[PDB]
Amino acid sequence: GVIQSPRHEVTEMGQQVTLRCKPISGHDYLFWYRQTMMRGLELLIYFNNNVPIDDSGMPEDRFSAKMPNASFSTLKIQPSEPRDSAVYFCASSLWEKLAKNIQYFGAGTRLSVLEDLKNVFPPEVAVFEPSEAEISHTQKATLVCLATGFYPDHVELSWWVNGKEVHSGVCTDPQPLKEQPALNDSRYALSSRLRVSATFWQDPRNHFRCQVQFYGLSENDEWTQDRAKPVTQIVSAEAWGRAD
Amino acid sequence: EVEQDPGPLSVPEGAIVSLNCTYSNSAFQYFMWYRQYSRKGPELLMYTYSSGNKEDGRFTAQVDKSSKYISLFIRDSQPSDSATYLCAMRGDSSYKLIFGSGTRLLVRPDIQNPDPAVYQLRDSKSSDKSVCLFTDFDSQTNVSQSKDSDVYITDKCVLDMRSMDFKSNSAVAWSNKSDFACANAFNNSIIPEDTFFPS
Amino acid sequence: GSHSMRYFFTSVSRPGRGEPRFIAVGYVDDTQFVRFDSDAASQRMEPRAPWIEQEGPEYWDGETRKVKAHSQTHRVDLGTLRGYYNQSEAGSHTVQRMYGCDVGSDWRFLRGYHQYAYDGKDYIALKEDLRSWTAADMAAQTTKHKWEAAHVAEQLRAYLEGTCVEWLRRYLENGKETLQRTDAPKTHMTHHAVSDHEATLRCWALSFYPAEITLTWQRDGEDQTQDTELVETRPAGDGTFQKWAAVVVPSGQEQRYTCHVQHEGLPKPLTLRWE
Amino acid sequence: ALWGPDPAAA
Amino acid sequence: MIQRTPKIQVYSRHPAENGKSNFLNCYVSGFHPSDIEVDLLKNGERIEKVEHSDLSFSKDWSFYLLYYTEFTPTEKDEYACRVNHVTLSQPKIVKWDRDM
Numbered sequence: 001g002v003i004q005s006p007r008h009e010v011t012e013m014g015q016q017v018t019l020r021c022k023p024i025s026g027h028d029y030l031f032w033y034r035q036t037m038m039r040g041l042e043l044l045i046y047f048n049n050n051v052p053i054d055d056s057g058m059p060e061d062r063f064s065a066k067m068p069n070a071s072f073s074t075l076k077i078q079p080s081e082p083r084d085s086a087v088y089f090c091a092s093s094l095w096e097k098l099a100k101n102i103q104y105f106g107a108g109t110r111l112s113v114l115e116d117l118k119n120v121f122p123p124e125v126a127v128f129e130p131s132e133a134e135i136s137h138t139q140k141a142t143l144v145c146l147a148t149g150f151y152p153d154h155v156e157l158s159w160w161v162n163g164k165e166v167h168s169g170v171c172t173d174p175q176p177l178k179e180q181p182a183l184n185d186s187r188y189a190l191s192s193r194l195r196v197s198a199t200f201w202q203d204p205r206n207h208f209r210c211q212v213q214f215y216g217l218s219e220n221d222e223w224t225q226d227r228a229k230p231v232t233q234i235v236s237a238e239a240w241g242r243a244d
Numbered sequence: 245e246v247e248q249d250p251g252p253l254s255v256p257e258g259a260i261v262s263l264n265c266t267y268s269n270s271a272f273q274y275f276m277w278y279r280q281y282s283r284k285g286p287e288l289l290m291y292t293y294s295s296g297n298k299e300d301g302r303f304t305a306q307v308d309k310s311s312k313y314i315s316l317f318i319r320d321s322q323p324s325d326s327a328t329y330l331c332a333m334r335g336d337s338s339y340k341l342i343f344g345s346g347t348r349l350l351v352r353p354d355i356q357n358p359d360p361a362v363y364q365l366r367d368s369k370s371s372d373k374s375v376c377l378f379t380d381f382d383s384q385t386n387v388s389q390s391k392d393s394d395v396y397i398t399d400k401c402v403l404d405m406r407s408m409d410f411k412s413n414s415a416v417a418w419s420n421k422s423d424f425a426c427a428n429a430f431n432n433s434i435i436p437e438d439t440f441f442p443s
Numbered sequence: 444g445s446h447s448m449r450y451f452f453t454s455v456s457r458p459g460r461g462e463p464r465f466i467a468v469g470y471v472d473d474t475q476f477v478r479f480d481s482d483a484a485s486q487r488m489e490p491r492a493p494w495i496e497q498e499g500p501e502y503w504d505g506e507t508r509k510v511k512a513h514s515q516t517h518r519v520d521l522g523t524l525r526g527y528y529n530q531s532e533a534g535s536h537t538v539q540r541m542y543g544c545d546v547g548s549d550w551r552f553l554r555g556y557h558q559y560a561y562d563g564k565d566y567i568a569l570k571e572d573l574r575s576w577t578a579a580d581m582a583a584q585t586t587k588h589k590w591e592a593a594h595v596a597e598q599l600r601a602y603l604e605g606t607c608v609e610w611l612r613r614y615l616e617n618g619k620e621t622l623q624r625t626d627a628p629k630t631h632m633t634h635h636a637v638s639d640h641e642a643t644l645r646c647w648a649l650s651f652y653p654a655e656i657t658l659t660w661q662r663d664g665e666d667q668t669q670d671t672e673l674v675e676t677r678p679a680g681d682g683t684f685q686k687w688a689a690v691v692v693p694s695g696q697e698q699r700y701t702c703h704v705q706h707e708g709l710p711k712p713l714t715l716r717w718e
Numbered sequence: 719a720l721w722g723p724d725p726a727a728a
Numbered sequence: 729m730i731q732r733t734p735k736i737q738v739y740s741r742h743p744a745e746n747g748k749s750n751f752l753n754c755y756v757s758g759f760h761p762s763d764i765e766v767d768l769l770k771n772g773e774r775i776e777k778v779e780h781s782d783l784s785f786s787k788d789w790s791f792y793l794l795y796y797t798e799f800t801p802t803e804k805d806e807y808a809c810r811v812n813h814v815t816l817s818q819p820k821i822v823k824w825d826r827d828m
Binding site for chain 4: 506538542566582589590599
């Protein structure tokens with residue numbers, strides 16, 4: 001489908017950010033959309049065969065779109081600003097589909113431009129074994145995770161069972177919640193649940209991992225703080241089956 | 245430009261729901277309804293070439309060019325459906341699509357056997373936050389946040405198991421404070437008087 | 444009485460130069476109102492009638508965009524058609540499009556049309572019923588199906604019976620001054636002694652509009668079409684048109700001949716004589 | 719006005 | 729590929745009158761393909777600031793153009809219209825005849 005890169009971009013302001021998009025092969029219409037949190041899609045610019053047809057959506061300064069070739073579009077942002085933080089969708093289509101108004105989007109690029117990277121912290125993940133009163137009253141069993149203290153909120157929580165990612169009986173929050181809410185600089189915390197049969201939980205052969213993917217700094221961004229560089233990383237927690 | 249009710253709006257499974265948008269600009273010849281989950285790309289639902297009604301499954305797209313008023317009706321709200329709905333439109337000049345800011349939607353699953361309960365999941369020795377689970381309760385109750393800062397509660401969250409066609413609304417609350425207890429963890433939440441309590 | 448709006452697009456490939464040469468011109472009746480030339484420094488839809496200059500940025504952005512889009516579609520079409528017809532990339536080729544709408548006396552929709560052409564010949568056209576097309580050849584039927592599968596015919600079907608007519612009626616209303624005017628033909632006759640036994644009678648009709656005119660040569664009241672010449676209605680270069688009608692007659696018999704001028708500008712068919 | 723948003727390529 | 733030779737009409741916008749400013753029109757039409765070179769001559773030497781109309785065409789798709797320059801006709805001075813096309817072996821000069 002439509003390939004966008006990066007999936008997540010956490011970068012300090014003032015630095016050039018390059019959003020890269022690969023439209024679906026053959027598609028001659030490449031759309032760039034920005035979706036700020038809780039807003040609808042705003043078309044930035046769309047090309048028709050490498051040429052910018054409707055750039056009426058581009059914010060003027062800093063934003064520089066282009067299609068060097070047909071299978072690659074570059075939306076560059078010089079002195080990137082925090083305000084740019086959004087989900088940039090690249091969309092792709094053909095005339096025939098466009099006549100019926102069918103567009104094909106990418107997964108988008110969760111861009112978070114920060115003022116200072118010293119506010120970047122990875123997640124603290126912790127799993128919680130089920131309450132045994134539940135296993136009898138409801139003859140089932142639900143675990144819980146709790147990634148905490150992370151910023152920004154670029155996290156992907158996923159329940160793994162026996163090394164395999166599970167989905168059934170799973171339920172993560174829509175969004176994280178701020179630990180110091182009033183502070184626009186605060187860190188976040190997520191949450192999820194994993195329900196299984198009573199007989200499944202008490203089998204100690206079963207392994208329950210709670211993986212929280214996080215996105216932060218990288219080799220580039222230069223770190224100085226005594227803390228461990230809050231690079232893009234994975235933090236997990238775990239619990240084991242037991243017929244206790 | 246187009247205006248659209250952002251309001252999350254919750255509906256009980258099986259109910260009819262009306263989504264709609266109003267727009268301040270004729271010329272718009274094409275009117276469509278997008279559906280969007282979390283942050284995933286938007287997917288088209290309905291597309292009407294011009295004024296008139298459009299019946300597709302449980303969905304009805306209506307466009308009133310006179311009133312500049314697009315609408316989408318959903319009947320017997322099914323499990324899915326819960327998502328942000330965006331109205332788009334355009335015409336003639338360009339393919340530049342114009343979207344409504346979106347309408348979040350929550351269709352609450354039914355509960356064949358609601359057994360409201362509250363459990364205190366054994367906090368892994370490592371962690372220091374007490375986790376209280378609230379599950380098996382019916383989609384008639386609404387879970388709320390809290391005043392003070394050191395109180396963290398997650399909005400309701402439907403648990404679906406498939407196979408064993410069971411579904412449980414679960415909520416999660418935690419805190420390091422020595423005052424946090426499963427007894428008064430869900431104070432701002434009008435939980436069923438029938439709800440169970442551990443002791 | 445009757446009116447129309449027509450758009451003429453001309454795109455010619457230029458092997459060796461950057462892009463193709465693209466020229467689009469808009470017409471209402473017989474007066475050009477918009478042009479676009481890719482070779483111009485503008486790269487914009489330009490006005491050619493004072494009554495289109497009334498339209499705002501929104502319009503011109505849309506037309507520039509649409510016409511650039513047309514240019515793109517044609518640039519791509521040049522490649523496509525070149526491929527459809529398997530032709531050298533060193534050769535210069537031409538795609539021409541024309542579409543528009545006709546209105547009656549009551550401006551009610553009469554007919555619509557969309558003609559497309561390659562290298563000066565009909566390529567594909569929207570039928571009278573505005574639902575079918577025209578397979579001038581396989582290249583065209585490819586485009587046809589490519590189009591009616593894309594429901595293109597319905598797009599135009601709406602645009603022609605609707606959009607373009609609405610716009611036409613809009614231009615007619617905004618261009619009443621020049622669109623609905625009728626400049627009467629400035630008729631007059633000239634006598635050239637082609638030889639000794641003959642003299643050429645040329646029936647001039649100068650500065651008339653629209654170009655639609657009927658010059659006839661009668662002799663003794665009876666129509667005559669032999670020994671009668673007639674030049675294509677030419678533009679004066681100021682909106683009006685010229686058109687003379689010559690006839691070769693035997694000397695002395697000049698009075699026997701009459702020129703019947705017919706025009707919407709003049710209520711009564713004029714009759715000319717003398718020389 | 720011009721047909722839109724465009725052809726409808728050959 | 730079809731090639732239509734230009735029809736050339738050399739005429740003034742208004743009836744000619746010695747010493748009075750006017751427009752020397754050259755109306756090439758029914759031609760094809762579009763590429764065409766038109767000069768408005770004065771006694772053989774081309775006129776420089778000659779303008780022309782935006783390319784168009786008619787029912788038969790054939791192109792027509794109006795090349796025009798302001799001139800002041802005289803007794804002596806001969807004006808012509810040098811048209812060269814892909815269908816013309818060599819520049820076709822059509823003298824301006826004020827009486828048609």
